[PDB]
Design a protein around this nucleic acid. Structure first.
Length: 75
DNA sequence: ACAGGATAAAGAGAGAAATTGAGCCGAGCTTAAGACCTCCTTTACCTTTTCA
């Protein structure tokens, strides 16, 4: 959602501002405090911002190394 | 990008319910020994047959 894009942009801007102010890469807790949000929310945003990798990425393709969901004939 | 506005769908606050497990008990249950009554076996002695 658009609000998520705006949240990610604000997180990037805050991180750059803290890096400029403190002269070093900010930690997760520092960013979470500055954003006034829990660290778990920040990690959730970071995980949801990822781009999906295509199944045909060379490793040979990625799609030939992923098992299938089901009950093993043995089970 | 950023600000405002509308809304619904998904969290926190409390008690009351419902469970829950915990101790502390004696009621239900098992174990073992001994005695003790049916059922059966086998004997000793017969009686009771069919036959030369």
């Amino acid at each position: 959602p658009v609000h998520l894009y705006e949240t990610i942009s604000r997180i990037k801007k805050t991180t750059k501002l803290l890096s400029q102010e403190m002269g070093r890469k900010p930690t997760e807790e520092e960013i979470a405090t500055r954003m006034e949000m829990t660290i778990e929310k920040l990690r959730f945003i970071a995980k949801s911002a990822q781009l999906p990798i295509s199944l045909e990425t060379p490793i040979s393709r990625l799609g030939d190394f992923i098992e299938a969901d089901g009950e093993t004939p043995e089970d």
